Coordinates of C-alpha atoms in Angstrom, one line a residue:
Chain V
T2 CA 71.1 99.2 85.2
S3 CA 71.8 100.2 88.8
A4 CA 70.3 103.6 89.5
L5 CA 69.3 105.3 92.8
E6 CA 65.9 106.0 91.2
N7 CA 63.9 103.6 93.4
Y8 CA 65.2 105.3 96.6
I9 CA 64.0 108.8 95.6
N10 CA 61.9 110.6 98.3
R11 CA 62.0 107.5 100.6
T12 CA 63.8 107.1 103.9
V13 CA 67.4 105.9 103.6
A14 CA 70.4 104.9 105.7
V15 CA 73.8 106.3 104.5
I16 CA 77.2 105.0 105.6
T17 CA 79.9 107.6 105.0
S18 CA 83.5 106.5 104.4
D19 CA 84.5 108.1 107.9
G20 CA 82.4 105.3 109.5
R21 CA 79.3 107.4 110.2
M22 CA 75.7 106.3 109.7
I23 CA 73.0 108.8 108.7
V24 CA 69.2 108.5 108.6
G25 CA 67.9 110.7 105.8
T26 CA 65.5 111.3 103.0
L27 CA 67.0 111.3 99.5
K28 CA 65.8 114.2 97.5
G29 CA 68.4 114.1 94.7
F30 CA 71.4 112.4 93.2
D31 CA 73.7 112.6 90.2
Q32 CA 75.9 110.1 88.3
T33 CA 78.8 110.5 90.7
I34 CA 76.5 109.6 93.7
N35 CA 76.6 113.2 95.0
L36 CA 73.8 112.9 97.5
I37 CA 71.2 115.7 98.1
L38 CA 69.4 114.8 101.3
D39 CA 67.0 116.2 103.8
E40 CA 66.0 115.5 107.4
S41 CA 69.2 114.0 108.3
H42 CA 70.2 112.7 111.6
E43 CA 72.7 110.2 113.1
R44 CA 72.1 106.9 114.8
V45 CA 74.7 106.4 117.5
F46 CA 73.4 109.1 119.9
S47 CA 69.6 108.9 119.5
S48 CA 69.3 106.7 122.7
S49 CA 71.2 109.3 124.8
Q50 CA 69.7 112.6 123.7
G51 CA 67.0 112.3 121.0
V52 CA 66.9 116.1 120.4
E53 CA 70.6 116.2 119.7
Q54 CA 70.1 113.3 117.1
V55 CA 68.6 115.8 114.6
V56 CA 71.7 117.3 113.0
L57 CA 69.8 119.2 110.3
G58 CA 67.4 119.2 107.3
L59 CA 69.1 119.8 104.0
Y60 CA 72.7 118.9 103.1
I61 CA 74.9 117.9 100.1
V62 CA 77.1 114.8 100.6
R63 CA 79.8 114.4 98.1
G64 CA 79.8 111.1 96.3
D65 CA 83.5 110.5 97.0
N66 CA 82.6 110.2 100.7
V67 CA 79.5 108.0 100.3
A68 CA 80.0 104.3 101.0
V69 CA 76.6 102.8 101.2
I70 CA 72.9 103.7 100.7
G71 CA 70.3 101.3 102.2
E72 CA 66.5 101.3 101.5
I73 CA 64.3 101.1 104.7
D74 CA 60.6 100.1 104.9
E75 CA 58.9 103.3 105.9
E76 CA 55.2 103.0 106.8
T77 CA 54.4 106.7 106.3
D78 CA 56.5 109.9 107.1
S79 CA 57.2 110.3 110.9
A80 CA 58.2 106.7 111.7
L81 CA 61.2 104.4 111.6
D82 CA 62.3 101.4 113.7
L83 CA 65.3 100.6 115.9
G84 CA 68.2 102.3 117.8
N85 CA 71.7 101.2 119.0
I86 CA 74.7 102.4 121.1
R87 CA 76.7 99.5 122.6
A88 CA 78.1 98.3 119.2
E89 CA 82.0 98.2 118.4
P90 CA 81.9 101.5 116.5
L91 CA 82.1 101.1 112.6
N92 CA 85.4 101.8 110.9
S93 CA 86.5 103.9 107.9
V94 CA 87.1 102.6 104.3
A95 CA 90.8 103.5 104.7
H96 CA 93.0 100.8 106.1
Chain R
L13 CA 103.6 130.6 82.9
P14 CA 104.2 127.6 85.4
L15 CA 105.1 124.9 82.8
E16 CA 107.4 127.4 81.1
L17 CA 109.2 127.8 84.5
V18 CA 109.6 124.0 84.7
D19 CA 111.0 124.0 81.1
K20 CA 113.5 126.7 82.2
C21 CA 114.6 124.4 85.0
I22 CA 115.7 121.6 82.7
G23 CA 119.5 121.0 83.3
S24 CA 119.4 123.1 86.5
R25 CA 119.3 121.7 90.0
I26 CA 115.7 121.4 91.3
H27 CA 114.1 120.5 94.6
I28 CA 110.9 118.4 94.4
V29 CA 108.7 118.4 97.4
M30 CA 105.9 115.9 97.7
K31 CA 102.6 116.1 99.6
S32 CA 104.2 114.2 102.5
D33 CA 107.3 115.5 104.4
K34 CA 109.6 114.2 101.7
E35 CA 111.6 115.8 99.0
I36 CA 113.9 115.0 96.2
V37 CA 116.8 117.3 95.1
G38 CA 118.6 116.6 91.8
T39 CA 119.2 117.8 88.2
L40 CA 116.0 118.0 86.2
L41 CA 116.3 116.0 83.0
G42 CA 112.8 116.5 81.7
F43 CA 109.1 115.9 82.3
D44 CA 105.9 114.9 80.6
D45 CA 102.3 116.2 80.3
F46 CA 101.4 115.0 83.8
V47 CA 104.7 116.3 85.4
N48 CA 106.3 112.9 85.9
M49 CA 109.9 114.0 86.2
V50 CA 113.1 112.4 85.3
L51 CA 115.8 113.4 87.8
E52 CA 119.6 112.5 87.8
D53 CA 121.9 111.8 90.9
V54 CA 119.2 112.4 93.3
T55 CA 119.3 113.0 97.1
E56 CA 116.1 111.8 98.9
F57 CA 115.3 113.7 102.1
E58 CA 112.7 113.1 104.6
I59 CA 112.1 116.5 106.3
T60 CA 110.4 115.2 109.5
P61 CA 113.2 112.8 110.4
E62 CA 116.0 115.4 109.6
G63 CA 117.9 113.1 107.3
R64 CA 118.6 111.9 103.8
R65 CA 117.2 108.4 103.0
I66 CA 119.3 107.7 100.0
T67 CA 121.8 109.1 97.5
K68 CA 120.6 107.9 94.2
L69 CA 122.9 107.5 91.2
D70 CA 121.7 107.6 87.5
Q71 CA 118.2 108.7 86.7
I72 CA 114.9 108.3 88.5
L73 CA 111.4 108.6 87.3
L74 CA 109.5 110.4 90.1
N75 CA 105.7 110.2 89.7
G76 CA 103.8 113.4 89.4
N77 CA 100.9 112.1 91.5
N78 CA 102.4 113.2 94.8
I79 CA 104.4 116.2 93.6
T80 CA 103.3 119.4 95.5
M81 CA 106.1 121.9 94.9
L82 CA 108.9 122.5 92.4
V83 CA 111.8 124.7 93.5
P84 CA 114.3 125.6 90.7
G85 CA 118.0 125.9 91.9
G86 CA 117.3 123.6 94.8
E87 CA 117.3 124.4 98.6
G88 CA 119.4 127.0 100.5
Chain G
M1 CA 84.5 95.9 80.4
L2 CA 85.7 92.4 81.6
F3 CA 84.5 92.6 85.2
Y4 CA 81.4 94.6 84.2
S5 CA 80.4 91.7 81.9
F6 CA 81.4 89.2 84.5
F7 CA 79.1 90.8 87.1
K8 CA 76.3 91.0 84.5
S9 CA 76.4 87.2 84.4
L10 CA 76.0 86.9 88.2
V11 CA 72.8 88.9 88.4
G12 CA 70.3 86.8 90.4
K13 CA 73.0 84.8 92.2
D14 CA 73.5 84.9 96.0
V15 CA 76.9 86.6 96.8
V16 CA 78.7 88.0 99.8
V17 CA 80.2 91.5 99.6
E18 CA 82.9 92.3 102.2
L19 CA 83.7 96.0 102.4
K20 CA 86.6 98.1 103.3
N21 CA 84.9 98.9 106.6
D22 CA 85.0 95.1 107.5
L23 CA 81.3 94.8 107.1
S24 CA 80.1 91.7 105.3
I25 CA 76.8 91.6 103.5
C26 CA 74.9 88.5 102.1
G27 CA 72.5 89.4 99.3
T28 CA 71.1 88.7 95.9
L29 CA 72.7 90.6 93.0
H30 CA 70.1 92.8 91.3
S31 CA 72.3 95.1 89.1
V32 CA 75.8 96.5 88.4
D33 CA 77.0 99.5 86.5
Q34 CA 80.2 100.6 84.6
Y35 CA 82.0 101.6 87.9
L36 CA 81.1 98.2 89.4
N37 CA 78.6 99.7 91.9
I38 CA 76.4 96.9 93.2
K39 CA 72.7 96.9 94.1
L40 CA 71.8 94.0 96.4
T41 CA 68.3 92.8 97.2
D42 CA 67.1 90.9 100.3
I43 CA 70.3 91.6 102.3
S44 CA 71.5 90.2 105.6
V45 CA 74.7 91.1 107.5
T46 CA 76.8 87.9 107.5
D47 CA 79.6 87.0 109.8
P48 CA 77.5 88.2 112.9
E49 CA 74.7 90.9 112.9
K50 CA 77.3 92.8 115.1
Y51 CA 76.9 95.6 112.7
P52 CA 73.1 96.1 113.5
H53 CA 73.3 99.6 111.9
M54 CA 71.0 98.3 109.1
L55 CA 68.4 95.6 110.4
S56 CA 65.4 97.3 108.8
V57 CA 67.2 97.4 105.4
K58 CA 66.3 94.9 102.7
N59 CA 67.9 96.4 99.6
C60 CA 71.2 98.4 99.4
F61 CA 73.2 100.3 96.8
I62 CA 76.9 99.8 97.3
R63 CA 79.4 102.3 95.9
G64 CA 82.0 100.2 93.8
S65 CA 84.9 102.1 95.4
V66 CA 84.0 100.7 98.9
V67 CA 84.1 97.0 97.9
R68 CA 87.1 95.1 99.2
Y69 CA 85.9 91.6 98.2
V70 CA 83.1 89.8 96.5
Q71 CA 82.9 86.1 97.6
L72 CA 81.3 83.8 95.0
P73 CA 80.7 80.0 94.7
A74 CA 82.7 77.9 92.2
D75 CA 79.4 76.7 90.5
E76 CA 78.8 80.3 89.2
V77 CA 81.8 80.7 87.0
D78 CA 83.3 79.2 83.8
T79 CA 87.1 79.4 84.6
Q80 CA 87.9 78.8 80.8
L81 CA 85.9 82.0 79.8
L82 CA 87.7 83.9 82.5
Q83 CA 91.2 83.0 81.5
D84 CA 90.5 83.4 77.7
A85 CA 88.7 86.8 78.2
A86 CA 91.5 88.0 80.5
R87 CA 94.2 87.2 77.9
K88 CA 92.2 89.0 75.3
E89 CA 91.5 92.0 77.6
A90 CA 95.0 92.9 78.9
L91 CA 96.0 92.7 75.2
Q92 CA 93.1 95.2 74.6
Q93 CA 93.8 97.8 77.3
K94 CA 97.4 98.5 76.2
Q95 CA 97.7 97.0 72.6
Chain H
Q6 CA 109.1 112.1 75.2
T7 CA 111.9 112.4 77.8
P8 CA 110.2 109.8 80.0
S9 CA 109.5 107.3 77.1
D10 CA 113.2 107.3 76.2
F11 CA 114.0 106.9 79.9
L12 CA 111.7 103.8 79.9
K13 CA 113.5 102.4 76.8
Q14 CA 117.0 102.7 78.3
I15 CA 116.3 101.3 81.8
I16 CA 114.9 98.0 80.5
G17 CA 117.3 95.3 81.9
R18 CA 119.1 97.5 84.4
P19 CA 119.0 97.0 88.2
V20 CA 116.6 99.5 89.8
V21 CA 115.0 100.6 93.1
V22 CA 111.2 100.9 93.0
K23 CA 109.7 102.8 96.0
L24 CA 105.9 102.7 96.6
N25 CA 103.8 105.5 98.2
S26 CA 103.5 103.3 101.3
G27 CA 107.4 103.6 101.6
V28 CA 108.2 100.0 100.7
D29 CA 111.4 99.7 98.6
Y30 CA 111.8 96.9 96.0
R31 CA 115.3 96.2 94.4
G32 CA 116.0 94.0 91.4
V33 CA 116.3 93.6 87.6
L34 CA 113.7 95.5 85.6
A35 CA 112.0 92.9 83.4
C36 CA 109.3 95.2 82.2
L37 CA 107.6 98.5 82.7
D38 CA 104.7 100.3 81.0
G39 CA 103.4 103.9 80.4
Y40 CA 101.3 103.8 83.6
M41 CA 104.4 102.8 85.6
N42 CA 103.4 99.2 86.2
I43 CA 106.6 97.3 86.9
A44 CA 107.8 93.7 86.8
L45 CA 111.1 92.9 88.6
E46 CA 113.1 89.7 88.9
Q47 CA 115.2 88.9 92.0
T48 CA 113.4 91.4 94.1
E49 CA 114.4 92.3 97.7
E50 CA 111.8 94.1 99.9
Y51 CA 113.0 96.7 102.6
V52 CA 111.1 98.7 105.3
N53 CA 112.8 97.8 108.7
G54 CA 115.5 95.4 107.5
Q55 CA 114.9 92.5 105.0
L56 CA 111.2 91.7 104.8
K57 CA 111.0 89.6 101.7
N58 CA 113.3 88.1 99.1
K59 CA 111.3 87.1 96.0
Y60 CA 112.1 84.0 93.8
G61 CA 109.9 84.8 90.8
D62 CA 108.8 88.0 89.0
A63 CA 107.0 90.5 91.1
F64 CA 104.4 92.8 89.6
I65 CA 103.9 96.3 91.1
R66 CA 101.0 98.7 90.5
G67 CA 101.9 102.0 88.8
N68 CA 99.2 103.9 90.7
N69 CA 101.0 103.0 94.0
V70 CA 104.6 103.6 92.6
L71 CA 106.3 106.7 94.0
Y72 CA 109.6 106.4 92.2
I73 CA 111.8 104.1 90.0
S74 CA 115.5 104.5 90.1
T75 CA 118.6 102.8 88.6
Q76 CA 120.7 101.1 91.2
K77 CA 124.4 101.8 91.0
Chain L
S11 CA 86.2 128.8 84.7
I12 CA 85.1 130.3 88.0
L13 CA 88.1 132.1 89.6
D14 CA 90.0 134.6 87.5
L15 CA 93.4 134.7 89.2
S16 CA 94.3 138.0 87.4
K17 CA 92.7 139.8 90.4
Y18 CA 95.2 138.0 92.7
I19 CA 98.2 138.4 90.1
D20 CA 100.7 140.2 92.4
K21 CA 99.7 140.0 96.0
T22 CA 100.5 137.5 98.8
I23 CA 98.0 134.6 98.9
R24 CA 97.3 131.8 101.2
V25 CA 97.2 128.3 99.7
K26 CA 96.3 125.1 101.5
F27 CA 97.4 121.8 99.8
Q28 CA 96.2 118.2 99.9
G29 CA 99.0 116.6 102.0
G30 CA 98.4 119.0 104.9
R31 CA 100.8 121.7 103.7
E32 CA 100.1 125.4 103.9
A33 CA 102.0 127.8 101.6
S34 CA 102.0 131.6 101.5
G35 CA 103.6 133.7 98.8
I36 CA 103.2 136.4 96.1
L37 CA 101.3 135.2 93.1
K38 CA 103.5 135.8 89.9
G39 CA 101.7 133.6 87.4
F40 CA 99.3 130.7 86.8
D41 CA 97.6 128.5 84.1
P42 CA 93.9 127.2 83.6
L43 CA 94.9 124.0 85.5
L44 CA 95.7 126.1 88.6
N45 CA 99.5 125.5 88.5
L46 CA 100.9 128.6 90.2
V47 CA 104.2 130.5 90.2
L48 CA 104.7 132.0 93.7
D49 CA 107.5 134.3 94.9
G50 CA 108.7 134.8 98.5
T51 CA 107.4 131.4 99.3
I52 CA 107.0 130.2 102.8
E53 CA 105.9 126.6 103.5
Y54 CA 104.3 125.6 106.7
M55 CA 103.7 122.1 108.0
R56 CA 101.1 120.8 110.5
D57 CA 101.9 118.5 113.3
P58 CA 99.5 117.5 116.3
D59 CA 101.4 120.1 118.5
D60 CA 101.4 122.9 115.9
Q61 CA 97.9 124.4 115.5
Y62 CA 97.8 128.0 116.7
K63 CA 101.5 127.7 117.2
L64 CA 101.9 127.6 113.3
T65 CA 105.1 129.7 113.1
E66 CA 107.8 127.3 114.4
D67 CA 107.0 124.9 111.6
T68 CA 108.3 127.3 108.9
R69 CA 110.6 126.7 105.9
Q70 CA 111.6 129.4 103.3
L71 CA 111.6 128.3 99.6
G72 CA 111.9 131.5 97.6
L73 CA 110.5 131.1 94.0
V74 CA 108.3 128.0 93.6
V75 CA 105.7 126.3 91.5
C76 CA 102.7 124.8 93.2
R77 CA 101.1 121.9 91.4
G78 CA 97.4 122.7 90.6
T79 CA 96.4 119.0 91.0
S80 CA 96.9 119.1 94.8
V81 CA 95.5 122.6 95.5
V82 CA 92.6 122.4 98.0
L83 CA 91.8 126.0 98.7
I84 CA 93.1 129.5 97.8
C85 CA 92.3 132.8 99.5
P86 CA 93.8 136.3 99.9
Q87 CA 96.6 137.2 102.5
Chain I
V14 CA 107.6 95.2 74.4
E15 CA 105.9 92.8 76.9
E16 CA 104.1 95.0 79.3
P17 CA 103.9 93.9 83.1
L18 CA 100.3 93.1 82.4
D19 CA 101.4 90.9 79.5
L20 CA 103.9 89.1 81.7
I21 CA 101.4 88.7 84.6
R22 CA 98.9 87.0 82.0
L23 CA 101.6 84.4 81.5
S24 CA 100.8 83.4 85.2
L25 CA 97.1 82.8 84.4
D26 CA 95.7 79.5 85.8
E27 CA 98.7 79.4 88.3
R28 CA 98.9 79.9 92.0
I29 CA 100.0 83.5 92.8
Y30 CA 100.9 85.4 96.0
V31 CA 99.2 88.8 96.4
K32 CA 100.2 91.3 99.1
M33 CA 97.3 93.7 100.0
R34 CA 96.9 96.9 101.9
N35 CA 96.1 96.5 105.7
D36 CA 98.8 93.9 106.4
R37 CA 97.0 91.1 104.5
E38 CA 98.0 88.6 101.9
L39 CA 96.2 86.2 99.6
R40 CA 97.4 83.1 97.9
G41 CA 95.2 81.5 95.2
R42 CA 94.8 80.5 91.6
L43 CA 94.7 83.5 89.2
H44 CA 91.6 83.2 86.9
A45 CA 91.4 86.7 85.8
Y46 CA 92.6 90.3 86.1
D47 CA 92.3 93.7 84.3
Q48 CA 94.5 96.8 84.0
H49 CA 93.2 98.2 87.4
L50 CA 94.4 94.9 89.0
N51 CA 90.9 93.8 89.8
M52 CA 91.4 90.0 90.2
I53 CA 89.3 86.8 90.3
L54 CA 91.0 84.2 92.3
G55 CA 89.8 80.6 92.8
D56 CA 90.8 78.4 95.8
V57 CA 92.1 81.3 97.8
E58 CA 93.5 81.7 101.3
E59 CA 93.5 85.1 102.9
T60 CA 95.9 85.7 105.9
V61 CA 95.4 88.7 108.2
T62 CA 98.5 89.8 110.2
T63 CA 98.2 91.9 113.4
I64 CA 100.4 93.3 116.1
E65 CA 99.4 92.5 119.7
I66 CA 101.5 94.5 122.3
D67 CA 102.3 93.4 125.8
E68 CA 100.7 96.2 128.0
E69 CA 103.6 96.2 130.5
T70 CA 106.7 95.7 128.4
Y71 CA 105.5 97.2 125.1
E72 CA 107.0 94.1 123.3
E73 CA 105.1 93.2 120.1
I74 CA 103.8 89.7 119.5
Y75 CA 102.8 89.0 115.9
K76 CA 99.5 87.1 115.5
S77 CA 97.6 85.9 112.4
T78 CA 94.3 84.4 111.4
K79 CA 93.3 82.8 108.1
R80 CA 90.2 82.7 105.9
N81 CA 89.8 80.4 102.9
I82 CA 87.1 80.7 100.1
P83 CA 86.3 78.9 96.7
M84 CA 86.0 81.9 94.5
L85 CA 86.7 85.6 95.2
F86 CA 86.7 88.9 93.4
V87 CA 89.4 91.4 94.7
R88 CA 89.2 95.1 94.0
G89 CA 92.4 96.4 92.4
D90 CA 92.9 99.4 94.7
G91 CA 93.6 97.0 97.7
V92 CA 96.5 95.3 95.8
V93 CA 100.1 96.4 96.6
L94 CA 102.0 93.5 94.8
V95 CA 101.7 90.2 92.9
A96 CA 104.3 87.4 92.9
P97 CA 104.3 83.5 93.2
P98 CA 104.3 81.7 96.7
Chain J
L2 CA 69.8 117.3 90.4
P3 CA 72.6 118.2 93.0
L4 CA 74.9 120.6 91.1
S5 CA 71.7 122.2 89.7
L6 CA 70.7 122.9 93.4
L7 CA 74.1 124.5 93.9
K8 CA 73.8 126.6 90.8
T9 CA 70.4 127.9 92.2
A10 CA 72.0 128.1 95.7
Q11 CA 74.1 131.0 94.5
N12 CA 73.8 133.7 97.3
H13 CA 72.8 131.3 100.2
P14 CA 74.8 130.9 103.5
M15 CA 76.7 127.6 103.7
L16 CA 78.8 125.6 105.9
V17 CA 81.5 123.5 104.2
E18 CA 83.2 120.6 105.9
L19 CA 86.4 119.6 104.0
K20 CA 88.4 116.4 103.9
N21 CA 90.8 117.9 106.4
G22 CA 88.0 118.4 109.0
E23 CA 88.2 122.2 108.6
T24 CA 85.0 124.1 108.4
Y25 CA 84.3 127.1 106.1
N26 CA 81.3 129.3 106.7
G27 CA 80.4 131.7 103.8
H28 CA 78.0 132.8 101.2
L29 CA 78.2 130.9 97.9
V30 CA 79.0 133.1 94.9
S31 CA 79.7 130.6 92.2
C32 CA 80.0 126.8 91.5
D33 CA 81.2 124.9 88.5
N34 CA 80.2 121.5 86.9
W35 CA 83.1 119.9 88.9
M36 CA 81.7 121.3 92.2
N37 CA 84.5 123.8 92.9
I38 CA 83.2 126.9 94.8
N39 CA 84.0 130.5 95.4
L40 CA 82.3 132.1 98.6
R41 CA 81.8 135.5 100.1
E42 CA 82.7 136.5 103.7
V43 CA 84.4 133.5 105.2
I44 CA 85.2 131.9 108.6
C45 CA 87.9 129.2 108.8
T46 CA 87.6 126.9 111.7
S47 CA 89.1 123.5 112.8
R48 CA 86.7 120.6 113.7
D49 CA 87.5 121.3 117.4
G50 CA 86.3 125.0 117.0
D51 CA 89.6 126.9 116.6
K52 CA 89.0 130.0 114.4
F53 CA 92.3 130.5 112.5
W54 CA 91.4 133.1 109.9
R55 CA 88.7 135.3 108.2
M56 CA 88.6 136.2 104.5
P57 CA 86.3 138.0 102.0
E58 CA 86.5 135.5 99.0
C59 CA 87.8 131.9 99.1
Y60 CA 88.1 129.2 96.4
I61 CA 87.5 125.5 97.4
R62 CA 88.5 122.6 95.2
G63 CA 85.5 120.3 94.9
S64 CA 87.6 117.1 95.5
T65 CA 88.2 118.3 99.0
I66 CA 84.7 118.8 100.0
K67 CA 83.2 116.3 102.5
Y68 CA 79.8 117.9 102.6
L69 CA 77.9 121.1 102.5
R70 CA 75.2 122.0 105.1
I71 CA 72.7 124.4 103.3
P72 CA 69.9 126.4 105.1
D73 CA 66.6 124.6 105.9
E74 CA 65.0 126.8 103.1

């Protein structure tokens, strides 16, 4: 079985089908991958203005628009690694 | 009732407008549950380019996937 | 069923998933579901790490709808099973 | 029922099959199914002139088919 | 289910559709699948140059059926 | 009534030509497929076709690249058409 | 859990970004099991910020939703 159970209330990286990465915390999911997430922010703008990086806490992503969820090795809340901005911006799932 | 209106349009001229700027005018022969439509001697128009693309002869099956609007009696 | 059962046989094999976004991911197949969503353990971005948007990510859930390609080795597959099962399956879906 | 009878009496006729992407395929209708999957023999492909002529059967996805028409 | 269209049964409504189309017309009837019968139907298209200038891109269609499968939003007009 | 799927399973074990969304084609040996047109192909060659444009004249030069792989699963939603080579 | 949060989110302010990049700002009055919504007191906006129209009720097909930004509550 492949469930998103192990990724509950842990830091996650989400790629939307638009070509947009998100750092977030996965609070809830359903069987269509409708993602309930908190403490979301981008990744492409954190190196320019780190205040503007924080989009929000609390949003519903629809499972139709989710491409990818990745599990990241969070030490304790209030920490993550890395940043980027000179990369060939990622594309959409449409071709 | 909308499907009753489409039943009333069997054997009449009808114009079938897709989601895209494309439309299909012809005589409505019938349809199924999903609104796949059988049309006879059909003119295919692209609206955006201001021109017909083909004059069809005989019957076409036009899939109900992209069908947005059905206009009984045709254009004007 | 056919490809669901096919991917159940490849759990614990090393595979490369190439997506609709042009991103290519090496990883070890951990699980699959009825929509052919993939969960991959110990991932690395193949081709180059030109997509650095992960890095700190070791296990990913992939939505089955965003897969373009799954590259496999020839050693992993019985081609006789696949042709026999396929002839039986297309016969099953329509009857 | 009107479509299933259509399906029965267009087997073997020459047809035009247009996809959602706007590609047009012309040839003899070897088979069709209820989901609008198509096989055509002797198929030409049009978009901006002649793009392909096909020498064996070509199989087309019904989910991508916009229309099927008899050619006369 | 959620929206009873009987409250909208006889007034002009605004309907956006999946391919980018906007249509406006008087609701005359409907089904549970959200197929609609509209009268006095106007269809509007959207181009890169037609945004607040949404009036030049106007076709009249009279009595129509809008397919409930491609309906994306419905609101009063 | 042979369905299109019944007639495409007559081409099993044989080399097929698949035209895909995004100006790409594959050629390979058809090991499997289902009703969604998911496909397992062995000994495949992918070809990616692109349009380079001269900046000054706007004249298009067609260019291509190729990838080859032993065994490959293809999701059926990318498939536009199947035929032989 | 998500549709359950939307069922309890009845009466909250919400911002809805659709597939077509249009924004809806309103107060959720109802959802269904397929994620269709009705909302009270509504602002329609393009992604670039153009306010085109204002309505009291609106119905949004769940298939056209990109995401819903809820309050931080």
